Amino acid sequence: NVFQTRAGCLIGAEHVNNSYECDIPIGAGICASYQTSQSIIAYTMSLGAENSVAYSNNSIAIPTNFTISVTTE
């Protein structure tokens, strides 16, 4: 099996038209991942998820409730 990238010649992994978070970043935004029976796919990463905020000049959204998240640095 053979693919062709912007990064180089990729061999042994299957193209996928879908787009997920980046996993084994390679080059030019081609992030290989083993999720799929299984095989190694390679799929253009979609930066982040997607959202579009609903904005209108009188529309405000106030959080009514909170959490407390202890992180680690």
Binding site: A54, N57, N58, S59, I60, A61, I62, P63, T64, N65, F66, T67, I68, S69, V70, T71, T72, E73
Partner: protein, 228 residues
């Protein structure tokens, strides 16, 4: 306070689970500790390299060769090994500033974040920062940032001011909002709607200029107190 108590208590718990099963957290520390032993091995192996001299055991020349040739060979060892130190010494100096730069970043967080409350956004961790708890780890430090992340949104119709008599009332602290009938002035980062009275709102200008202002009555604290 109760609900906050549990949210924090739980939160500490989940840490221990991220730390129990997972090696991804401590990569930073772990990656540092390797890069040394990495270099040291490299630094050690460089002993056994020929560097072009007849052998890398410094006295197995001397048995083979009469000194004046060894004096030529032992150069290529020295010259080899010596250079191999500077390359190691440098890599320490460079790396030692890759730590030294991180120290100051901790020496900051240890001051501003722990000892203070840091307004700097996403410095003390994503969300609004309440406090932080340091914990030591080998050749490193681990901060537990207790951060405040808001949760449940609700849409609201807002207005940048309110016309009462033609004066414009603006909120002293927080936004005007409404759920679609009554007008509430509330604080911004949490929802506690409060009736709009002249102590929530300071008069300014008047109503023709504002862009977006809406009608309403701003209730007088005092007027009721009167009539008797």
């Amino acid at each position: 306070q109760k609900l906050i108590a549990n949210q924090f208590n739980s939160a500490i718990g989940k840490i221990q689970d991220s730390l129990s099963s997972t090696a991804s957290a401590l990569g930073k520390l772990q990656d540092v500790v390797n890069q040394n032993a990495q270099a040291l091995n490299t630094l050690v192996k460089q002993l056994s390299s020929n560097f072009g001299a007849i052998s890398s055991v410094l006295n197995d020349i001397l048995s083979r060769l009469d000194p004046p040739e060894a004096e030529v060979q032992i150069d290529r060892l020295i010259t080899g090994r010596l250079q191999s130190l500077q390359t190691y010494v440098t890599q320490q100096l460079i790396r030692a500033a890759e730590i030294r730069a991180s120290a100051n970043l901790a020496a900051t967080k240890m001051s501003e974040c722990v000892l203070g409350q840091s307004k700097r956004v996403d410095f003390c961790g994503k969300g609004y920062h309440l406090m932080s708890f340091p914990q030591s780890a080998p050749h490193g430090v681990v901060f537990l940032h207790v951060t405040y992340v808001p949760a449940q949104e609700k849409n609201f119709t807002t207005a940048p001011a309110i016309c009462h008599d033609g004066k414009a009332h603006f909120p002293r602290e927080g936004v005007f909002v409404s759920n679609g009938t009554h007008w509430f002035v509330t604080q911004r980062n949490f929802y506690e709607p409060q009736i709009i009275t002249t102590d929530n709102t300071f008069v300014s200008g008047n109503c023709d200029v504002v862009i977006g202002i809406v009608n309403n009555t701003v209730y007088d604290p005092l007027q009721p107190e009167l009539d008797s």
